[PDB]
Design a protein around this ligand. Structure first.
Ligand SMILES: [Zn+2]
Ligand SMILES: [Zn+2]
Ligand SMILES: [Zn+2]
Ligand SMILES: [Zn+2]
Lengths: 140, 165, 36
């Protein structure tokens, strides 16, 4: 895989000056300046569904760090991008919309009908230690 | 689409008992048409027995979200040279979002439409060169596939252009 | 209206016609969502 990407598919080289760069990111920045079109805003947001464009690389660095920070779900630690990403993923845990089933983390048999009732099993066969966070998190 | 993807990948099931809106219609038929969703029905027991609530769920560990977006740059040039480029040489985000939506709207119902035929339907707005620019960008974002003999055909997840509303 | 129902009530209704689909669902799904 490395041989193909270093002897035949020269993807890390400039299309114009024939320098090369240690990551595609720096090649992109290089093309955006040293071989740039007459465009006023040489930088464009690299992320999903974002259409914004910028004059100086520092403003793009700021925009990525502000509006596309890479987060982990507070409950399930799965990664997501930006405020919308977190708010979209938080629906999955929501007990008002997602009228989910109720089970033990270990015991195969459980089949509760309400959240308060599920805490009886975790309060007796387990205890207040090693209950799952989605059950515990009365955060709203 | 993002809400549905997260729910189905999380092993949740969606229950429909009333008519989905015109927008939820696109995303539901798309997922159904791809064979990714299983369907089951909650039985009942009048006319209403022939239209019971419907349940939808993901078939297995199979993924619904498309791969991460690449930096497919908007076609730009000298000031005023395109409908979406203003006098300061900048992208008019409103007009770009409108023209990309307009071109996809005509290619959906006309699978295989050629650049010449497509220019005729948009003549009061875009030149042929401007449609060559829009179609190239949409091919690079995988919203379209080139049919044989130089036609355009809309791919799955075509409504996933930009975040808004 | 199924909007008011519990997860156990919904799977019980499915089991009235065919227990195989109901048992399969209980063994796999984590929860219903109303399409709202
Ligand atoms: Zn170069
Ligand atoms: Zn952005
Ligand atoms: Zn989570
Ligand atoms: Zn247990």
């Amino acid at each position: 895989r490395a041989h193909i990407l270093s002897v035949h598919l020269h993807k890390l080289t400039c299309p114009h000056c024939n320098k090369s760069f240690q990551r595609p990111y720096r090649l992109r920045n290089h093309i955006s300046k040293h071989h740039d079109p007459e465009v006023e805003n040489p930088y464009q947001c690299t992320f999903a569904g974002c259409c914004k464009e910028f004059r100086i690389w520092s403003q793009l660095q700021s925009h990525i760090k502000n509006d596309h920070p890479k987060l982990k779900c507070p409950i399930c630690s799965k990664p997501c991008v930006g405020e919308n990403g977190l708010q979209m993923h938080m629906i999955i845990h929501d007990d008002s919309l997602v009228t989910k089933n109720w089970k033990c983390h270990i015991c195969p048999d459980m089949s509760f009908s309400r959240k308060h009732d599920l805490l009886t099993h975790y309060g007796s066969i387990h205890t207040e230690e090693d209950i799952p966070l989605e059950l515990k998190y009365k955060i709203s | 689409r993002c809400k549905v993807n997260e729910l189905l990948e999380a092993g949740n099931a969606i229950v429909i008992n009333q008519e989905p809106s015109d927008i939820s219609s696109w995303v539901l038929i798309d997922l159904i048409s791809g064979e990714l969703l299983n369907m089951d029905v909650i039985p009942m027991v009048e006319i209403r027995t022939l239209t019971p609530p419907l349940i939808i769920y993901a078939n297995s560990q199979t993924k619904l979200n498309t791969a991460r977006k690449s930096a497919v740059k908007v076609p730009l040039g000298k000031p005023f040279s395109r409908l979406w480029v203003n006098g300061s040489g900048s992208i008019r985000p409103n007009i770009w979002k409108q023209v990309v939506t307009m071109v996809v709207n005509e290619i959906i119902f006309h699978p295989g439409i050629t650049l010449s035929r497509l220019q005729s339907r948009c003549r009061e707005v875009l030149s042929l060169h401007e449609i060559s620019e829009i179609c190239k960008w949409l091919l690079e974002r995988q919203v379209l596939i080139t049919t044989d003999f130089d036609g355009y055909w809309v791919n799955h997840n075509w409504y996933s252009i930009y975040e808004s509303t | 209206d199924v909007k008011t129902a519990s997860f156990q009530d919904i799977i019980n209704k499915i089991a009235k016609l065919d227990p195989k689909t109901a048992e399969t669902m209980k063994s796999e799904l984590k929860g219903f969502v109303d399409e709202v």
